């Protein structure tokens, strides 16, 4: 019962504690309410080594983004007055572009960032491919979002760690199903030594 946890980052620095969503519809904003099972307020998260750009970008996070669990799908609605970029391997693989594809969500818009059935079907056909193929599906249970600034293909910020303010989502549901398969996939092919 949490359907997803969310971790906030500032560049490549993990900032703040992990937020656990207990409500089917919440919001990740740049405000300071410390106790909202429906509001992951980033404004109250400190970072002793925070630079000007980060601080500046935090100011435009505003009402941020609204994530919400309709049936077996997750949606992200940009409440902020600035765009929010989403990198959902589950969402991209739907339109087809190289999983590492970042999709811009202009203010007032909203995108379907994840679909269970889709994932479950991708987990099923993976069992035949092998341990390795299944172990990598954890990436499919993750979604990365940047606030105000974009990244990836031709925003000269090629990696998330370059953005000032981004967040990572872990879908517990899918992770649990993956785990049940994983504990049955046997052992890896490629081996390893204790000294190397």
């Amino acid at each position: 019962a949490f359907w997803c946890s969310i971790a906030y980052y500032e560049l490549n620095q993990r900032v703040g504690e992990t937020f656990h969503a207990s409500q089917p519809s919440l919001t990740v904003d740049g405000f300071t309410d410390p106790s909202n099972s429906e509001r992951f307020c980033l404004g109250l998260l400190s970072n002793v080594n925070r630079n000007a750009t980060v601080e500046m970008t935090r100011r435009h996070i505003g009402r941020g983004v609204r994530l919400y669990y309709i049936g077996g799908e997750v949606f992200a609605e940009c409440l902020s007055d600035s765009a929010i970029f989403v990198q959902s391997p589950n969402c991209n693989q739907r339109y087809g572009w190289h999983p590492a594809t970042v999709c811009k969500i202009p203010p007032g818009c909203n995108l379907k960032i994840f679909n269970n059935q889709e994932f479950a079907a991708l987990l099923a056909q993976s069992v035949n491919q092998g341990f390795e193929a299944v172990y990598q599906l954890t990436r499919m249970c993750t979604i990365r979002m940047s606030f105000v600034k974009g990244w990836g293909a031709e925003y000269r910020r090629q990696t998330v760690t370059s953005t000032p303010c981004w967040i990572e989502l872990h879908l517990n549901g899918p992770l649990q199903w993956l785990d049940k398969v994983l504990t049955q996939m046997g052992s890896p092919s490629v081996r390893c030594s204790s000294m190397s």
Partner: protein
């Protein structure tokens, strides 16, 4: 000051050792008006936040030393809806950073380090003064915005920093608190709740 429900926790404490947060944030329930942050080692939360039981790979010879002297440390008490008091139960001094204390000294915001003496019981935060000072900033912005201060600048008003043993400031080898061998940053929840309210009244209208 406000009418909405009181916070689950009346503050959050994050221990540090230089520019690195050691251990996980300590949340004090509003039902625990007084909390103790000592250098002892009882893991059980409750009313005691034992810094002596926190591990750190980066920890040095100089910090293991200072940590040894935290002792009974200090205490943080919540009196009126959001007013915090400090009582140094340590054999060693403690250095506090407070706006309420800066103002009281006729000093500018952040232009002073307050050293508390063992056994001392001083007030370090006034919710009302904080609340006021927030709208104080929100007002000038609504103005400097139409005439033409962010969340990280004003959230400071709801924060308290305290260094154990060593002191920083303009009279010590250490310039900033990120240089002390061991300290903590306290976030007052009520002050933050009022801030969440004020933030909604700063007509975004800032422009990009």
């Amino acid at each position: 000051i406000s009418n909405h429900p009181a916070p689950e926790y009346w503050c959050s404490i994050a221990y540090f050792e230089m520019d690195v947060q050691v251990g996980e944030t300590f949340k004090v329930p509003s039902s625990c008006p007084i909390v103790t942050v000592d250098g002892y080692v009882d893991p059980s939360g409750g009313d005691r936040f034992c810094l002596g039981q926190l591990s750190n790979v980066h920890r040095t010879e100089a910090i293991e030393r200072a940590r040894l002297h935290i002792g009974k440390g200090v205490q943080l008490e919540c009196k009126g809806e959001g007013d915090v008091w400090v009582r140094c139960l340590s054999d060693h001094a403690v250095f506090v950073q407070s706006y309420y204390l800066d103002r009281e000294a006729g000093r500018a915001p952040g232009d002073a380090v307050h050293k508390i003496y063992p056994s001392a019981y001083i007030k370090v935060f006034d919710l009302r003064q904080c609340h006021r000072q927030m709208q104080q900033q929100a007002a000038t912005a609504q103005a400097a915005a139409a005439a033409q201060i962010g969340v990280d600048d004003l959230r400071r008003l709801c924060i308290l920093r305290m260094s154990f043993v060593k002191g920083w400031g303009p009279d010590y080898p250490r310039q900033s608190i990120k240089e002390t061998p061991c300290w903590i940053e306290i976030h007052l929840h009520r002050a933050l709740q009022l801030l969440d309210e004020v933030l909604h009244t700063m007509p975004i209208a800032d422009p990009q």
